[PDB]
């Protein structure tokens, strides 16, 4: 049997959408799914993790990504999702630098790198309706997003002829996704990529690729809109259909080859008559689509399949 090992933390690794998943992978009649357990990962060496001749591993809140790359260099699987780009995707800045090695639209943006020590020496000043940031102009709405990818306190600064004041964004909370505050002036503290803002129809487009040749796009509303989450009866966020066009599917084969990761989410921004990528997440799944969950599976199975079938003397086509 060809091993197929999954390290994520338990909330990830027990979760709906991967149960769904894992569950029709191991209908693949050569695969066997093994789940490292998470006290395994937190507390045991490497060298005492299971086995595998493919490994899907990827980064949460909490997790030891160094050892997932240790255990990656110890045992030489096949990785599907690439750990050390895992690093570069917590870092705005470093997502943001590939995007446009790559030729991919995205928003025109500014990193303001402040030295805790000395915070007011960094290259910022501030007007009423503007920023200068390294010199460069943003007038007013635009969008400020912390370096780490990790923390989504995202503000969004209105121009005095709306009224002036933020939107603060962050991750959500029940019926709530952001709130206005009359706060009008930028963040002092920490580093922060500023950012123009692009307008849409008032929502986002969420893209989750598996291999760069299929992706599932969805739309939901943008949280800064007014920040009143929109739920079904089941409490899951509202969706609205979403079908790439050829420029769009492009954009996810490019993201989901450049930062290496076969499952790969990612945000797209349709204005002005084009999309531009805002955000790249990295591992996930589509929730509560069993059509997702049917492809996704298939599409991973045979994955493992062409890449290790040789080697076990296994028929493939
Ligand atoms: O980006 P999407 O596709 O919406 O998925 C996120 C997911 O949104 P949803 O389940 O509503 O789609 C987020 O779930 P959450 O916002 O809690 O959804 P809900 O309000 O239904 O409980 C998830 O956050 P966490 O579970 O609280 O850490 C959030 O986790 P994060 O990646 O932001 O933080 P992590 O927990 O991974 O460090 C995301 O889950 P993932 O992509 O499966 O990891
Ligand atoms: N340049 C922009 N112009 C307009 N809206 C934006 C822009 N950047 C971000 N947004 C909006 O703000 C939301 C959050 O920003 P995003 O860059 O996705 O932050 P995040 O913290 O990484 N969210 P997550 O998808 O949960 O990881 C997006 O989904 C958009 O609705
Ligand atoms: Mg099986
Ligand atoms: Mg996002
Ligand atoms: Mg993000």
Same mark, same amino acid.
């Not at 959408?17 to 066997?32: D, G, Q, V, W």
């Not at 490994?55 to 690439?82: C, E, M, Q, T, W």
């Not at 020496?121 to 370096?147: A, R, Y």
């Not at 920040?227 to 259909?241: I, L, Q």
């Given at each position: ?8 933390m ?13 569950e ?16 395994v ?29 240790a ?40 990193i ?8 007011k ?11 200068e $940031? =390294? &010199?460069?102009? #943003?007038? /007013? ?15 969004i ?15 959500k ?42 992706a ?18 089941e ?18 084969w ?12 990612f ?12 955000? $790249? =997440? &990295?591992?996930? #799944?589509? /929730? ?22 040789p ?7």
């Amino acid at each position: 049997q060809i091993v197929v090992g999954i390290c994520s933390m338990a909330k990830k690794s027990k979760s709906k959408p991967m149960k769904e998943i894992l569950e029709r992978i191991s209908l693949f009649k050569y695969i066997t799914v093994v789940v490292f357990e998470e006290e395994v990962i937190l507390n045991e060496p490497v060298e005492n993790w299971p086995l595998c001749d493919c490994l899907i591993s990827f980064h949460s809140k909490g997790f030891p990504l160094d050892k997932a790359v240790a255990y990656a260099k110890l045992r030489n699987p096949f990785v599907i999702n690439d750990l050390n780009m895992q690093y570069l995707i917590q870092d705005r800045r470093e997502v943001y630098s590939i995007l446009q090695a790559e030729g991919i639209l995205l928003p025109r943006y500014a990193i303001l790198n402040r030295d805790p020590n000395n915070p007011k020496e960094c290259n910022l000043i501030e007007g009423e309706d503007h920023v200068e $940031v =390294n &010199g460069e102009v #943003f007038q /007013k709405p635009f969008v400020e997003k912390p370096v780490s990818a990790e923390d989504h306190n995202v503000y969004i600064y209105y121009p005095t002829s709306a009224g002036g004041g933020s939107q603060r964004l962050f991750r959500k909370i029940g019926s709530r996704s952001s709130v206005y505050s009359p706060e009008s002036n930028v963040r002092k503290t920490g580093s922060y990529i500023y950012e123009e803002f692009m307008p849409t129809d008032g929502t986002d487009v969420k893209v989750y690729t598996v291999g760069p040749d299929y992706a599932h796009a969805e739309a939901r509303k943008s949280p800064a809109l007014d920040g009143k989450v929109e739920r079904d009866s089941e409490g899951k966020e509202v969706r609205y259909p979403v079908i790439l066009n050829a420029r769009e599917k492009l954009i996810a084969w490019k993201v989901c080859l450049a930062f290496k990761q076969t499952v790969c989410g990612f945000d797209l921004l349709r204005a002005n008559g084009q999309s531009y990528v805002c955000d $790249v =997440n &990295g591992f996930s #799944f589509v /929730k509560n689509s069993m059509k997702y969950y049917d492809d996704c599976a298939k599409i991973l199975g045979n994955i493992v399949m062409r890449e290790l079938a040789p080697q076990f003397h296994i028929p493939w086509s």
